[PDB]
Design a binder for these strands. Structure first.
Length: 95
RNA sequence: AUUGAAAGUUCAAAGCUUAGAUACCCUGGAGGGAAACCAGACUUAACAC
């Protein structure tokens, strides 16, 4: 919290209340009312990434990039449609 | 008014002497310091555009 960009804006794009323009709302992420999930998302240093990439090969010389997103339990019924074709676009741009 | 009357079973006297709770006898037998556990998580900032 130094130069505004965290102030509200990203707190807004994570409110489980408060709007639906962001397809992802963290369960208890509250506007200035951070109790647990706020600190966990913003302060807990050891958090794995949900977006993950893998590379496979077979006995043939075929190789594939899997990109997947594990579903978490702090998403308040995430919009599975917006992030889905974000992932195809990411998987394209990196290959 | 009697086969009666009278008469202390009394005196002296150490349950003492000798004598080893000793002899033989393994705290031993059986029993796994093991069981579980990711050396891992993540990039961010600055200005230029």
């Amino acid at each position: 919290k130094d130069k505004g960009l965290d102030i509200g804006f990203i707190k807004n794009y994570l409110c489980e209340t408060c709007e639906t323009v962001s397809s992802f709302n963290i369960v208890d992420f509250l506007l200035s009312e951070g109790s647990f999930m706020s600190d966990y998302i913003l302060q807990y240093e050891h958090r794995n990434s949900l977006l993950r990439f893998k590379l496979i090969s077979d006995n043939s010389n075929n190789s594939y990039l899997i990109g997947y997103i594990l579903h978490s339990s702090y998403f308040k019924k995430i919009d599975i449609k917006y992030v889905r074709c974000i992932l195809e676009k990411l998987t394209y741009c990196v290959i």
